[PDB]
Amino acid sequence: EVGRVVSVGDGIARLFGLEGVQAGELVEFQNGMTGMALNLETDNVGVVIFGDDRSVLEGDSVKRTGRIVDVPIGPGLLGRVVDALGNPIDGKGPIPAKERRRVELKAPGIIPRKSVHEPMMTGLKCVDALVPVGRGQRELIIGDRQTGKTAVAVDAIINQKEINDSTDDESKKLYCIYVAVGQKRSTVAQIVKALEQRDAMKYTTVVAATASEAAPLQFLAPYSGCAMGEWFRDSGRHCVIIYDDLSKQATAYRQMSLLLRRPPGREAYPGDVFYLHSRLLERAAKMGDKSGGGSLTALPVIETQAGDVSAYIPTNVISITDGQIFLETELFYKGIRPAINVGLSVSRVGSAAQVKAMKQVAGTMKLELAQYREVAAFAQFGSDLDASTRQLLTRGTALTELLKQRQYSPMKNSVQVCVLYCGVKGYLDPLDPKEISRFESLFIDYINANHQDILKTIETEKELSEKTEAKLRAAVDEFVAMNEFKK
Amino acid sequence: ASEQSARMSAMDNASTNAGEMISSLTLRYNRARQAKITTELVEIISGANAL
Amino acid sequence: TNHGRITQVIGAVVDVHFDEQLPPILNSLEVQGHTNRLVLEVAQHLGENTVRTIAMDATEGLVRGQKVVDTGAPIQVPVGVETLGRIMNVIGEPVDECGPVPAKKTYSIHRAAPLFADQSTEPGLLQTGIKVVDLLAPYAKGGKIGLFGGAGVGKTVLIMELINNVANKHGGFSVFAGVGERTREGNDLYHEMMTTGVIKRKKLEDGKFDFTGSKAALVYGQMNEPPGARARVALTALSVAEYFRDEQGQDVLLFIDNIYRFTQAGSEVSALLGRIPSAVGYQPTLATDLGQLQERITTTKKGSITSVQAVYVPADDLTDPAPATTFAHLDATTVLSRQIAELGIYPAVDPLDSTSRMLAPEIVGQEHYDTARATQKLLQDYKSLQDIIAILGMDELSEEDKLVVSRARKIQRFLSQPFTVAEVFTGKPGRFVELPETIKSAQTILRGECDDLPEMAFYMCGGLEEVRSKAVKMAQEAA
Amino acid sequence: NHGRITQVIGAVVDVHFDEQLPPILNSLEVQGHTNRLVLEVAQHLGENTVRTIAMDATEGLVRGQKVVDTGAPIQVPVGVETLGRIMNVIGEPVDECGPVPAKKTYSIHRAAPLFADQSTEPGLLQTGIKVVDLLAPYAKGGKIGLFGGAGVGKTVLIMELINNVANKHGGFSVFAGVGERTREGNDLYHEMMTTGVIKRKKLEDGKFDFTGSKAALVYGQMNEPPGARARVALTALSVAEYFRDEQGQDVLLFIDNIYRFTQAGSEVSALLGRIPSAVGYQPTLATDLGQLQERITTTKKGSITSVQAVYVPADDLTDPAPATTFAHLDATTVLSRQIAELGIYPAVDPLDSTSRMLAPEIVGQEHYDTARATQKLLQDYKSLQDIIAILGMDELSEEDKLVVSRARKIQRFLSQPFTVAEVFTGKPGRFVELPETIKSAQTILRGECDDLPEMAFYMCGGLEEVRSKAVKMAQ
Ligand SMILES: Nc1ncnc2c1ncn2[C@@H]1O[C@H](COP(=O)(O)OP(=O)(O)OP(=O)(O)O)[C@@H](O)[C@H]1O
Ligand SMILES: Nc1ncnc2c1ncn2[C@@H]1O[C@H](COP(=O)(O)OP(=O)(O)O)[C@@H](O)[C@H]1O
Ligand SMILES: Nc1ncnc2c1ncn2[C@@H]1O[C@H](COP(=O)(O)OP(=O)(O)O)[C@@H](O)[C@H]1O
Ligand SMILES: [Mg+2]
Ligand SMILES: [Mg+2]
Ligand SMILES: [Mg+2]
């Protein structure tokens, strides 16, 4: 059937007609613009427009296509940048994909799932050690503005090119999806450039719902990304999806709901914000061996104001996630970059999403860092301390100086194991803290020059036998002999 | 003896400074209290008039 | 059966028009012509033979004028021993992928609470195997229990430990209701229940199943589901338990994760149903909607239901209306803290906010009452000395105060213990501490017998003897 | 097409057309009126009725007046003829120098450039200011924000950037005044006529010749309705887009304050029949801003550098307006009142300030390391403020005392006397290059300036001035 526009304003239309409309279907005007029907009132119909409202004219004919709002899926998206609806914006060719998928869908149930056991190598040291991440997990990256969240996510994306290049088994490769809500196109272009400069786009796609783009696209983009990732999840191929920032999506939803004359709630938001984020994040899952064995990891991002996680959106997304990676400005300016607060940051999965070789070191590291955090304040004042307490302070300072990293400079798992071994067994206590930043680098080059076999063995066996232990100890001794530092 | 005299003087100054900080924080607390009341009430009213 | 026509659709709210014979409130309506089953629960009568209903599943795909059929009764859930060993939805449909529920009976989830004349029973003591709980906040066998805490404090782990330590030993049946929790948690719980014999699934050559035994029933309304489902799934599980209480007369165990989600669901739709919001966005019908639930959970002269509710406390604010209202509905309370969990003291129970009606000298003897009150006095004394220690230092404290601080730290570390389900976090094995051992150990520590023993020794130790063994080991390793 | 006014509510007018409606954003002229009242369509309401926002005062309108549809949105002239000339939101010049004889006119409303038509090449600017050159380097071809309350020095900082950049630019420039004082507008006009940025010449026959000018001016000030404040930035953006599209030349755009633009929406949406958001702001607070900012962007054709002063009401940075604006900026500069009370000017908080052009792949590693060491020092000093206020400096150790000394010294050293402040400060201006700043910071951090006093770093620029002042202070 067809209908006619009755009212138009602020990217929203009120129609008269189309009595056979499905709630949530696409609608087409007589000028190419599209819309989505949400409020099926009695007299009129409330449509949200996918673009500017200058085209609609209060009398224009309108037609229903019968399609529920859907997006394309497949490997045709890899290497491409697309909008919320799958339309490309890279400017190079169309999207070669035949199979589509509905945006809003029912998450998978309790039975076709399994526990999280495989890790998702983030490339960082503090995350992969103290706040591990699994495949099928939903871990939040929450912080303030300009603290290193997008950087964490982009390093997670970049670390995968070595793992993917050194195989042709799709069951082991990890594909990636970056959803940019509210960002400006300059930032998205910078991210695309940073990924292309490192050949990290042949396994990624991007979904850009920027600020100039209307509210419905910002509201739909994360669901479009989850739909694109469900192809990997159900096909047996692992994928990780990153949402930057989710809060922007909540703001867009508030805008749409307020312009549809729906009543507000707390902070002018609706009550359906929890349902919005639960709908979105429960689609991340680790499926069973009967459903292929795929996965869809999620790494949402949230920007708090003044570190207030007592707010309305942070509280919800904290209560519906399997972890937290807090980021602070005090730690960011003190010198700790990434600025991960290892106290508040947790991971309910934990060691199950960690390699044994990393377990052996990270347990001791977490214990030592707890003790160091406990006595750090007392130590600053300056009072006589026992040798054991001083040793604790020295080891905590060493480990804190170890977990620092440059931007876009991730590392393999075996190298993290080796470095944290050097840090835990006491080969950094006498050394000057400020010197460690090169002890790391040189040591890495050394074990990539003359000790590739240790790395291959750790990569294959994924553990530290006594033989590899002794070999690594001998390598560290040779390295300290060949080199000299301030202590 | 000099140590104890200086200790008494320092405690005096610290108590005075604490009183000053208490005054400032009391002002801020009352401001935030009024803001909370106004914000909650405006939320309720805006939800009541959008019916 | 009547016949109606959908008139409008706003999120999870659906208006329906009948030509005659309006259905009563709380009745169930079935939409015809939809992809999957879609049930609506009547909520309001508006006028002109129009009603306003709440959808259990997503309204995506609904059409105006689409047809609706009244069932003549509210959402009827199946009941019996056939629900045992089996998972069920809010509308009674199974989601375990094992076959349909061959129940010979159905109960309406909406019922009236037992009257005042149906009195309770004696405050029977419940032994959980947890120390701080059995000591300072004893749980009643026939009363409601609350586990208050924010996010990341150990509510789910504590419920799982209670299941391992109670449900297996319980001779009656048991029920679990997942009200807006994570689905991963449900999968883990189902697998652990199949492992420890609480569920006994036996596949057959003819493709059927056999859940003989399996003294447990599961109901799930998780976050993926919309409002209307999260709200009514608790009533579903409560009716499933009320069947065993009333007819069978067996003692029943009910576990709810989290109850707060049920209240949140109402808020998500209240403004769509034309209600004015309350103080902080919650609905007006908060206390009543929660009390109509809670009063159905109570012991009678036919059976007993022991409930254990985990209450999310957002932003660690106990002044929020939902937990504030829930506090009055509970016999035993257990408040978990973050400041304690930061010290690695798990379970992170605050013994100064946890209370219990049972902690009285007539129910538990004075050896228990005085011990608990002395522990609480000691901990409050240690809490009052915190500022003096922070400003001046330990040098200023007298030897009495130093003894107090030492004993309080030892008590804090001693109330901790490792659970069997937390092996996958700590690696240490689990313990089951009976109550007399706890009372003996607390009396011993408060009397001053163990002042010589080091503070570190009292960590994740089931009993004082274990503490002695750990101290011996630490002293031997010292030389 | 003719139409009738049916309803008037302050700065909103509901009009009724009979035959055919005008689209949204179209301009409408009221005929029975003294001035040239222009109305911008915003909504459609049925019954062939339209809702509009007025670009001028509605005092004198009548229910029944006649309205004429122009068939297109507001049109602002463009070219090198707008240079050296003031122009209000509707393009009408208010310079009292004649009309604008420009050939082409652009619409106020244009779609932003696409994703493919972007070029994020990193460059730097020479502002001459120590704090921004060190800790928040400004990006050539990017957006820059100056956040602050009232009385912290945004306007003075923008004027300093004008004197230190625009005069040494060569290319073109634009200034948009969105709800600022008319006084400072006249002051800027005369300062520009002085410095040669505007080269006005009066011909014998009363005409004028602005040939040689390098700066346009657009002013919608406080003495204007909200509709004439929520459409001025768009006028300036059209004027600058003409340059960086057809001309293909770099341009500098200065906006004072952008927040006023959102404020106008706040005092309009209530009349347009919209439900308010958290703090009375609009539900359209983000799209109305993103549609303005995304038009500002360097592309493959040209580049727009932008310097926006963002008001912060009640010194609350959690307000929705600055919170939304933070996401659109490439560089940031957060001014503070706590630092201005200490007499430090510019009152920049170097910790809340940040930038994207600070990485070592853009600036060197010596610059990056100096900046990060300074930030660490100032954070370590901030962490001791409570214990210093309660107890005192005596409780601190010697390392902490050295830290406090160097932090106070580097705070006072990041204070520059500008040239435009000479009228209320007296001391002459001090342009400062970047390597001198870096050397001075390195020396202060090492410990090569602990012997000097603390008040010797106040308003001195480089270090030679600091040592000379310490010498003179020894007496
Ligand atoms: N490991 C790191 N080491 C040094 N600098 C870092 C590191 N990680 C991030 N940064 C720096 O932090 C600053 C902000 O980068 P980022 O893109 O991550 O911001 P953000 O946290 O996502 O907040 P927003 O995007 O809202 O501005 C950059 O200057 C970046 O160089
Ligand atoms: N007894 C415990 N021992 C060790 N760690 C615990 C314990 N209880 C909780 N934790 C930690 O806190 C996290 C809380 O998860 P959960 O048990 O679901 O509590 P909640 O639902 O209240 O957030 C656990 O994953 C674990 O890391
Ligand atoms: N560098 C400076 N030196 C001395 N005084 C300054 C300086 N900057 C600002 N001020 C003072 O603060 C006031 C700020 O007013 P203004 O320049 O209009 O900033 P804003 O736009 O934030 O209100 C000025 O009156 C001036 O006296
Ligand atoms: Mg970011
Ligand atoms: Mg939980
Ligand atoms: Mg100003």
Q: Of all atoms in ligand 2, which is nearest to the CA of residue A348?
A: 25
Question: Which residues have beta carbons under 5 A from ligand 5 (an ion)?
Answer: C 156
CA torsion angle D94 D100 D104 D110 (round to 10): -10
Q: Indicate which of A14, A38, A40, A114 best probes the interface with C, i.e. most C CBs within 10 Å of its own CB.
A: A40
Among residues C297, C296, C219, C298, which one has the least CA distance to residue C257?
Answer: C219
Question: Where do breaks (C to N over 2.5 Å) occur in chain C, by preceding residue number?
Answer: none
List, in sequence order, the alpha helices (H) in chain B.
2-49
B-chain residues near D280 (CB < 8 A)? 42
User: Cα of C75 to ligand 2 centre, how many Å?
Assistant: 35
Tally of CB atoms within 10 A around C207: 7
Q: Which of A215, A263, A381 lies nearest to residue D287, judging by beta carbons?
A: A215
Question: Does B10 contact D391 at a Cβ distance shorter than 8 Å?
Answer: yes
Give the helix/strand (H/E) hosting D26. Answer: strand D26-30
Using the Cα atoms of residue C403, residue C408, residue C413 and residue C419 in order, give the sign of their dihedral.
positive
Extract the tokens encoding A345.
Answer: 């940051």
Longest Cα–Cα distance of chain C, Å, equals 90
What DSSP designation does C297 have? Answer: S
Cβ–Cβ under 8 Å, residues C63 and A68: no
The values of phi and psi at residue D145, to 5°, are -125, 140
| Residue located via tokens 């979105």 | A280
For residues A281 and A300, what is the distance between their CA atoms, to the nearest angstrom?
Answer: 9
Give the helix/strand (H/E) hosting D221. Answer: none
Distance in Å, alpha carbon of B40 to nearest chain A alpha carbon: 8
Angle at which helix C287-294 crosses helix C229-243, to 10 degrees, equals 20
For residues D46 and A468, what is the distance between their CA atoms, to the nearest angstrom?
Answer: 79
Cβ–Cβ under 8 Å, residues D184 and D192: no
Q: Whose CA is nearest to atom 2 of ligand 3?
A: D345
Among residues D121, D244, D235, D272, which one has the least CA distance to residue D172?
Answer: D244
Among residues A65, A82, A61, which one has the least CA distance to residue A73?
Answer: A82
Among residues C305, C315, C221, which one has the least CA distance to residue C259?
Answer: C221
For residues C15 and C272, what is the distance between their CA atoms, to the nearest angstrom?
Answer: 11
What DSSP designation does C349 have? Answer: B
Extract the tokens encoding C441.
Answer: 């150990």
Angle at which helix D434-446 crosses helix D398-413, to 10 degrees, equals 160
Angle at which helix A273-281 crosses helix A246-259, to 10 degrees, equals 140
Distance in Å, alpha carbon of B7 to nearest chain D alpha carbon: 11
Extract the tokens encoding D365.
Answer: 């590693």
Question: Does D298 contact A7 at a Cβ distance shorter than 8 Å?
Answer: no
Cβ–Cβ under 8 Å, residues C44 and C25: yes
Three-state DSSP class for residue D307: strand
Read out DSSP for A184-237? Answer: -HHHHHHHHHHHHTTT--TTEEEEEE-SSS-HHHHHHHHHHHHHHHHHHHHHT-
For residues D431 and D418, what is the distance between their CA atoms, to the nearest angstrom?
Answer: 8
Cβ–Cβ under 8 Å, residues C74 and C41: yes
Antiparallel, parallel or unpaired: β C304-312 and C251-257: parallel
Resolution of the structure in the document, Å: 3.1
Three-state DSSP class for residue B51: coil
Q: Which of B17, B46, B50 lies nearest to residue D390, judging by beta carbons?
A: B17
Ligand nearest to the CA of A141: 1
Extract the tokens encoding D13.
Answer: 């007018």
Among residues A441, A368, A375, which one has the least CA distance to residue A398?
Answer: A368
Give the helix/strand (H/E) hosting A288. Answer: none
D142 Cβ under 8 Å from any chain A Cβ: yes
Extract the tokens encoding A466.
Answer: 């006594």
Tell me the residue ranges of DSSP E strands in A275-372: 295-303, 323-327, 346-347
Cβ of A247 closer than 6 Å to ligand 1, yes or no, is no
Extract the tokens encoding C416.
Answer: 């901790």
Query: In this structure, which amino acid lies at residue C430?
Result: G
Please work out, in degrees rounded to the nearest 5, the angle formed at the alpha carbon of residue B33 by the alpha carbons of B31 and B34: 70
Question: Does A113 contact C183 at a Cβ distance shorter than 8 Å?
Answer: yes
For residues A424 and D372, what is the distance between their CA atoms, to the nearest angstrom?
Answer: 28
Antiparallel, parallel or unpaired: β A100-102 and A238-244: unpaired
Cβ of A409 closer than 6 Å to ligand 1, yes or no, is no
Read out DSSP for D410-428? Answer: HHHHS----STTHHHH-SP
For residues A157 and A204, what is the distance between their CA atoms, to the nearest angstrom?
Answer: 8
Cβ of C418 closer than 6 Å to ligand 2, yes or no, is no
For residues C344 and C413, what is the distance between their CA atoms, to the nearest angstrom?
Answer: 9
Q: Of all atoms in ligand 2, which is nearest to the CA of residue C426?
A: 4
| Residue located via tokens 């002293």 | C475
Please work out, in degrees rounded to the nearest 5, the angle formed at the alpha carbon of residue A90 by the alpha carbons of A86 and A96: 50
Cβ–Cβ under 8 Å, residues C385 and C404: yes
CA torsion angle A287 A289 A293 A297 (round to 10): 30
Cβ–Cβ under 8 Å, residues A48 and A12: yes
Q: Which residues of C101-136 are buried (b: 16+ CB within 10 A; e: fewer)?
A: bebeebbebbeeebeeeeeeeebbebbbbbbbbbbb
Please work out, in degrees rounded to the nearest 5, the angle formed at the alpha carbon of residue C258 by the alpha carbons of C255 and C260: 135
Cβ–Cβ under 8 Å, residues C180 and C222: yes
**A71: CB partners within 8 A, 6+ apart:** A84, A85, A86, A100, A101, A103, A224, A227, A228
Three-state DSSP class for residue C17: strand
Please state how this structure was obtained. cryo-EM
Antiparallel, parallel or unpaired: β A25-29 and D12-17: unpaired
For residues A278 and C346, what is the distance between their CA atoms, to the nearest angstrom?
Answer: 29
For residues D470 and D72, what is the distance between their CA atoms, to the nearest angstrom?
Answer: 66
For residues C469 and C449, what is the distance between their CA atoms, to the nearest angstrom?
Answer: 16
Domain segments of chain C as ranges: 1-74, 75-358, 359-479
Ramachandran category for residue A302: left, alpha or beta (phi over 0 → left; psi -120 to 50 → alpha): beta
Cross-sheet strand order for the sheet of A346-347: A81-82, A204-209, A174-181, A238-244, A295-303, A140-143, A323-327, A346-347
Give the helix/strand (H/E) hosting A81. Answer: strand A81-82
Tell me the CB-side half-sphere exposure of residue C172, using CA atoms within 13 A.
Answer: 20
Cβ–Cβ under 8 Å, residues D358 and D368: yes
The values of phi and psi at residue A58, to 5°, are 60, 70
Please work out, in degrees rounded to the nearest 5, the angle formed at the alpha carbon of residue C62 by the alpha carbons of C56 and C68: 70
Kindly tell me the burial class for residue C315, based on how many C-beta atoms sit within 10 Å of its own C-beta (0-12, 13-18, 19 or more).
middle
Is A348 part of the annotated catalytic residue set?
yes
Q: Which of 288-327 (A) contact B at CB < 8 A?
A: none
What DSSP designation does A106 have? Answer: P
Question: Does C227 contact A275 at a Cβ distance shorter than 8 Å?
Answer: yes
**B23: CB partners within 8 A, 6+ apart:** none
Q: Indicate which of A8, A10, A206 best probes the interface with D, i.e. most D CBs within 10 Å of its own CB.
A: A10
Three-state DSSP class for residue A143: strand
Q: Give the Å distances, CA to CA, from D361 to A134, C107, D122, D356.
A: 32, 70, 10, 11
Extract the tokens encoding D160.
Answer: 């300093």
For residues A31 and A13, what is the distance between their CA atoms, to the nearest angstrom?
Answer: 14
